[PDB]
Amino acid sequence: KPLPALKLALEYIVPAMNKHGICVVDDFLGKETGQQIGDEVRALHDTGKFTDGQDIRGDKITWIEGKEPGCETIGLLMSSMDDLIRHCNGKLGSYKINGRTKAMVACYPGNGTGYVRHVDNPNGDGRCVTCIYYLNKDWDAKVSGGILRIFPEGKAQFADIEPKFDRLLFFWSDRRNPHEVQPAYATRYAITVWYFDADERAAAKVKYLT
């Protein structure tokens, strides 16, 4: 009953991303797996593993590789994301996607926290696609806010993305999609991975010193 990943990628994600630069897949993993991911994320939060995401942003974050004890289902989510990008078979724009970040697990801990309008990759750092999975059971922005508002370039209207349970979102990471997280009034969780274009990443426009 769920669309197979290969068909989902080729028949929907590829055409939607090339047409709109934004693509939402609802009901990505199903209730049982979405809930397990929630349990794993709440466990990370409750045992104090998050740090300040940073005013520009009021989220708390941690990075997950996917093999850590207690993170097996998050690892399943990450491999499911990777499978979708592989099935896209180079058809997302002209990018040569060969890598990605670890998963960024993020919490906006209610109390009106959010993220001011920003571009993920404004300086050519190689990130081409942002992939976010939301895991907020019964989230309703009418009560709890927390909408992701995207302002796609060339378009007059904005795109509001509620951080709905089991919702997968893709969007170009570059200046085409400035976006903001509106104030959140309940605990809002999301997991993001960014995918890299091989060539842009190799141009080393950003040097990280330590």
Binding site: K1, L8, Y12, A16, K19, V24, V25, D26, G30, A159
Partner: peptide, 13 residues
């Protein structure tokens, strides 16, 4: 199983 192509949302199920 229906994508309204002027939109950017689809349910997988």
């Amino acid at each position: 199983x229906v994508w309204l192509t002027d939109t950017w949302v689809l349910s997988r199920t």
